[PDB]
């Protein structure tokens, strides 16, 4: 049980490390009964149960993961170049002395050669914050494309929206290839109503439904090349459930575009309950190049205001 060693090294009052089925795992429980389960050595956060209702067991599950297969399910961080750079399962904790009981934070760290991709999973009493930060060490600027693919579950198949991506343009674009996929990038654009290529369209719906196949990316990086005003897309939006009365807000920091993916009717090909949505911030069309030695940051924050 190496997680026992990590617990007596960095375990705190609200941080509990566990090891079962040879999976190193950690649970973060802040004062208000909000739980957060993270699988160590993989940079894959599985379950997130924040206190939504004011009952005793009012906390509800947010991230869609299947029962026995933690490999396919939950929010996960992703890096490509054009292949998955962080496919190595070499993540290790760095520090946890974060706050008293109110908010907790785990600092995973790996190394893909010249890149020190360190990674922060922070629990505040209403929010997950999944925050990547990389740093070059070699004498080559890298052309990586990062992303943080979250998989939010909805109780009702019809109760699905995002509520606030209007006004900003989008292109239907496949997702980034993840080790924690639910649909492949080739089938996410298949069996529709958006056309596969990067055709651009201004959104004219204050809350875009997630009933159909349409899996797209909001942002105009062609105008980002202008580095004028360029109409920066909204850095936050209200994803709603509407089967049960709650919602969430996905705040992006550092990332440039926002990917959304609706499985449509083909969620029955994988799962039988809790129809989900694959939403995450990315820098996918125009990659990010840091330097031959600088650092770059990017974070995604799910927060609720029901409490």
Partner 1 sequence: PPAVDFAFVHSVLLPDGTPDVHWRRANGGQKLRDIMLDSNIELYGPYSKPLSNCAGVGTCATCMVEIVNGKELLNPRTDIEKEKLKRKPKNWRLACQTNVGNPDSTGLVVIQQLPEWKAHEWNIPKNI
Partner 2 sequence: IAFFGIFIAYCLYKPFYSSLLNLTLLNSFQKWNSKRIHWEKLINFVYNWSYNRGYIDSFFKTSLIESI
Partner 3 sequence: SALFHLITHAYSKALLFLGSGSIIHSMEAIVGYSPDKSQNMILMGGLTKHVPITKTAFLIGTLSLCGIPPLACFWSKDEILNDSLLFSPIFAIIACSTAGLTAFYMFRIYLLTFEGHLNTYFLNYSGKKSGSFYSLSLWGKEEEKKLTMNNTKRASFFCNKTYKISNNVRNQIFITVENFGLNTRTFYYPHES
Place of tokens 């029955």: 268
Shortest Å, Cβ 236 to partner 3: 7
In the region spanning residues 88 to 147, those forming contacts with partner 1, defined by CB under 8 A, are: 124, 127, 129
Is 122 a binder of partner 3 (CB under 8 A)? yes
Is 303 a binder of partner 2 (CB under 8 A)? no
The pair of structure tokens assigned to 275 is 């129809």
Name the residue among 85, 109, 115 with its Cα closest to residue 293. 115
Give the interface segment with partner 2, choosing from 12-20, 175-183, 221-229, 235-243 (CB under 8 A): 235-243
Shortest Å, Cβ 41 to partner 1: 26
Shortest Å, Cβ 250 to partner 3: 12
Shortest Å, Cβ 154 to partner 2: 11
Place of tokens 């694959």: 278
209 binds, among partner 2, partner 3, partner 1, none (CB under 5 to 8 A by kind): partner 2
Is 56 a binder of partner 3 (CB under 8 A)? no
Which x/- pattern over 240-259 shows residues binding partner 2 (rule: CB under 8 A)?
A: xxx--xxx------------
Which x/- pattern over 117-156 shows residues binding partner 2 (rule: CB under 8 A)?
A: ----------------------------------------
Name the residue among 299, 302, 304, 241 with its Cα closest to residue 74. 302
Shortest Å, Cβ 299 to partner 3: 5
34, 49 Cβ separation under 8 angstroms: yes
- Site residues for partner 2 per CB under 8 A: 158-161, 163, 204-209, 211, 238, 240-242, 245-247
- Site residues for partner 3 per CB under 8 A: 53-54, 94-95, 98-99, 102-103, 105, 107, 118, 120, 122, 124-127, 129, 131, 133, 226-228, 236, 238, 249, 253, 295, 297, 299, 301, 303, 305-307
- Site residues for partner 1 per CB under 8 A: 124, 127, 129, 166-168, 228-232, 234-235, 251, 253, 299, 301, 303
């Amino acid at each position: 049980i190496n997680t026992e060693k990590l617990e007596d090294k960095f375990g705190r009052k609200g941080i509990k490390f566990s090891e079962s089925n040879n999976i190193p795992m950690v649970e973060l429980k802040v004062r208000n009964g909000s739980s957060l389960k993270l699988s160590l050595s993989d940079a894959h956060v599985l379950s997130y149960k924040p206190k939504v209702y004011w009952k005793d067991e009012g906390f509800e599950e947010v991230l869609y993961t299947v029962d026995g297969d933690e490999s396919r399910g939950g929010v996960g961080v992703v890096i490509v170049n054009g292949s998955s750079v962080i496919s190595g399962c070499d993540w290790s904790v760095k520090d946890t002395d974060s706050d008293a009981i109110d908010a907790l934070q785990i600092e995973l760290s790996c190394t893909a050669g010249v890149l020190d991709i360190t990674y922060i999973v922070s629990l505040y009493p209403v929010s997950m914050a999944t925050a990547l930060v990389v740093k070059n060490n070699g004498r080559k600027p890298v052309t990586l494309k990062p992303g943080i693919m979250s998989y939010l579950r909805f109780k009702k198949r019809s109760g699905a929206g995002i509520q606030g991506l209007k006004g900003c343009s989008y292109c239907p674009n496949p997702p980034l290839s993840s080790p924690f996929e639910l649909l492949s990038p080739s089938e996410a654009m298949k069996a529709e109503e958006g056309e596969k290529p990067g055709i651009w369209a201004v959104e004219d719906s204050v809350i875009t439904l997630l009933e159909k196949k349409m899996s797209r990316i909001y942002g105009a990086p062609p105008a980002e090349r202008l580095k004028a005003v360029y109409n920066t897309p909204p850095s936050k939006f209200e994803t709603i459930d509407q089967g049960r009365g709650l919602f969430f807000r996905m705040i992006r920091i550092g990332f440039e575009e926002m990917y959304v993916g609706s499985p449509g009717s083909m969620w029955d090909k994988y799962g039988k309950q809790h129809y989900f949505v694959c939403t995450g911030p990315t820098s996918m069309l125009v990659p990010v190049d840091v330097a031959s030695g600088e650092t770059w940051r990017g974070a995604m924050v799910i927060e609720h205001d029901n409490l």
